[PDB]
């Protein structure tokens, strides 16, 4: 659980990009099969996405990197 | 608050009265002039009466 978001917004400092990136990350962690790269403590996907952000691990460009890595791994097994 | 730089989460009426009763002075009160070894000792003194 967590209370505030300042430690999260400070590195995504638009306070709106935070919502979008953590939302897509929580999507990939909830509807996708991705496991949280930050330890889970009986916490929903939203606070898990925030924690993954605050640890300097999940950001917009990191999410794009993960997306294109998945794309490359998908198209590598299709050839 | 977006209206002004004054914070909107402000202790409204009862907590502020309690704080005023706390943070005040009367020139004669039980155990005045004592020297304290930190705020924790002040809490220990007050809760012991």
């Amino acid at each position: 659980a967590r209370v505030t978001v300042q430690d999260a917004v400070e590195k995504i400092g638009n306070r709106f990009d935070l919502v979008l990136v953590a939302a897509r990350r929580a999507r990939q962690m909830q509807v996708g099969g991705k496991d949280p790269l930050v330890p889970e403590e009986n916490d929903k996907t939203t606070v898990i996405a925030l924690r993954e952000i605050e640890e300097g691990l999940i950001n917009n460009q990191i999410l794009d990197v993960r997306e294109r890595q998945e794309q490359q791994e998908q198209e590598a097994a299709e050839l | 608050s977006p209206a002004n730089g004054e914070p909107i989460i402000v202790p409204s009426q009862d907590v502020v009265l309690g704080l005023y009763y706390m943070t005040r002075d009367c020139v004669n009160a039980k155990g005045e002039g004592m020297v304290l070894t930190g705020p924790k000792e002040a809490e220990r003194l007050y809760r012991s009466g």
Binding site: - | G31, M34, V35, L36, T37, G38, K40, E41, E43, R44, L45, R47, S48
Partner: protein, 219 residues
């Protein structure tokens, strides 16, 4: 009729060895407070425990004075004595002699061992000395009294901190049981001087309160 839910030290998440936070399982409503307040009164009121009660400064004789070299006012070399957590066994009115010269602070480790008298905070800086020639000394008389007692109630007299605990605060809050409406989760967050462990402080306070109940103890 008499079945009452009892917790077992459910959360003892001690932060440091001088500050723990005991949080019990839900207790029947009206009992979180009746236990927190009881233990608070026991702990802030009376336990066996040694602390400084008075001191005779060698050179200084009045309560309001100052000696050179010791930039700390004598009133402050008295507060640091109140902070001087000391534990003794068997002996009660033991007198401790402090004697050190030279530039620098006077740590609590400078007090001579004086038999079985132990100090739990050796690096407690009482006062600082700025001169090699200045030889500060005193006879700090610690005592294993029971419970806090200031100097106004009763050579320089200092307030006593006979209670090993320094801060008692219980913030009882609602808990839940599968059907029971509202049971209270007591949360004792408590510090100590360091002489006695916080968990041990709670255990000894409970022991004292129960021993004051043995006459009407049944089953």
């Amino acid at each position: 009729v008499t079945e009452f839910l009892k917790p077992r030290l459910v959360d003892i998440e001690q932060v440091s060895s001088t500050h723990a936070k005991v949080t019990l399982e839900p207790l029947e409503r009206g009992f979180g407070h009746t236990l927190g307040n009881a233990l608070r009164r026991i702990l802030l009121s009376s336990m066996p425990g040694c602390a400084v009660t008075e001191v005779e400064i060698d050179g200084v004789l009045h309560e309001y004075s100052t000696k050179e070299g010791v930039q700390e006012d004598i009133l402050e070399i008295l507060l640091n004595l109140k902070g001087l957590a000391v534990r003794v066994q068997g002996k009660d009115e033991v007198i401790l002699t402090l004697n050190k010269s030279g530039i620098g602070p006077v740590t609590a480790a400078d007090i001579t061992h004086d038999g079985d008298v132990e100090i739990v905070k050796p690096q407690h800086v009482i006062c600082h000395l700025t001169d090699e020639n200045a030889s500060i000394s005193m006879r700090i008389k610690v005592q294993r009294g029971r419970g806090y007692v200031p100097a106004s109630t009763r050579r320089l007299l200092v307030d006593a901190c006979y209670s090993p605990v320094e801060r008692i605060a219980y913030n009882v809050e609602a808990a839940r049981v599968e059907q029971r409406t509202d049971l209270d989760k007591l949360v004792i967050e408590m510090e100590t001087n360091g002489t006695i462990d916080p968990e041990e402080a709670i255990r000894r306070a409970a022991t004292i309160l129960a021993e004051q109940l043995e006459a009407f103890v049944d089953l």
